[PDB]
Amino acid sequence: MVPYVPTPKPVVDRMLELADVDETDVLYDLGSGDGRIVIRAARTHGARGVGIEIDPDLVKKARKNAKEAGVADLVEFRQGDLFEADISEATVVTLYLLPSVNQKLRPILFEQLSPGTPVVSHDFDMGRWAPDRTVDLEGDTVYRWTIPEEIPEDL
Ligand SMILES: Nc1ncnc2c1ncn2[C@@H]1O[C@H](CSCC[C@H](N)C(=O)O)[C@@H](O)[C@H]1O
Ligand SMILES: [Cl-]
Ligand SMILES: [Cl-]
Ligand SMILES: [Mg+2]
């Protein structure tokens, strides 16, 4: 079970840089919490955003946060389980979940996401799926992968 403890805002900024997020992107944050990843993607980079979040109290907070930030026209939140969500329109995916949850999610990412889609994770890796980047911050790690044209036979 993934607790609500958010990614610090400076770490969020580094995640968005690492994925080269820009105004043409549609960023999906899977387990979106207070909405900070999608809100900062919209405010800083002009990207459209979708946050998927299971807890209705956090969906409510995130919607309020987006309105207060002046980015409600760019950002949408959906109440639901991320393992059941349609994420195929994502051009970038961001994650701060758990090691076991990342492992369960991996095949869904391969099923739904277009080749070339960046995936960025705070702190937790994807097992034998090797990252393209690993950024060491003071007390946090950020990984990036790019969805390949062919899934490695190992995976
Ligand atoms: N199966 C699931 N589907 C959607 N959201 C889930 C989920 N399991 C846990 N969550 C949510 O995932 C969030 C993890 S905290 C991370 C929040 C945000 N992405 C950030 O980085 O700041 C919590 O808000 C929790 O309620
Ligand atoms: Cl919304
Ligand atoms: Cl790079
Ligand atoms: Mg890009």
Please state the three-class secondary structure of the chain as a single string: CCCCCCCCHHHHHHHHHHCCCCCCCEEEEECCCCCHHHHHHHHHHCCEEEEEECCHHHHHHHHHHHHHHCCCCCEEEEECCHHHCCCCCCCEEEECCCHHHHHHHHHHHHHHCCCCCEEEEECCCCCCCCCCEEEECCCCEEEEEECCCCCCCCC
Half-sphere exposure (Cβ direction) of 124: Cα atoms closer than 13 Å: 16
Nearest CA to ligand 1 atom 13: 31
Ligand 1 — pocket residues by CB below 6 A? 2, 4-7, 29, 31-33, 36-37, 52-55, 58, 81-83, 96, 122
Q: Six-digit token pair at 55? A: 């807890």
Centroid of ligand 4 to alpha carbon of 23 (angstroms): 10
Mutation choice for ligand 1 from 32, 65, 101, 103, CB with most ligand atoms inside 8 A: 32
Does 81 count as an annotated binding residue?
yes
Domain count, the chain: 1
* Nearest Cα residue to 87 out of 114, 115, 58: 114
For CA atoms 98, 144, 111, 53, give the dihedral sign.
Answer: positive
Q: Six-digit token pair at 110? A: 């391969």
For CA atoms 7, 65, 40, 21, give the dihedral sign.
Answer: positive
Structural domain range at position 143: 2-155
By what technique were these coordinates determined? X-ray
Nearest CA to ligand 1 atom 24: 33
Centroid of ligand 4 to alpha carbon of 47 (angstroms): 11
Q: Which residues contact 26 (CB under 8 A, 6 or more apart)?
A: 47, 48, 49, 50, 89, 90, 91, 92
Report the b/e string of 106-120 with b at 16+ CB within 10 A: beebeebbeeebbbb
CB atoms within 10 A of CB 3: 6
Q: Which atom of ligand 1 is nearest to the CA of 82?
A: 3
**Alpha-carbon span 142 to 39, nearest angstrom:** 19
CATH code at position 46: 3.40.50.150
Q: Classify residue 80 as left (phi > 0), alpha (psi -120 to 50) or beta.
A: left
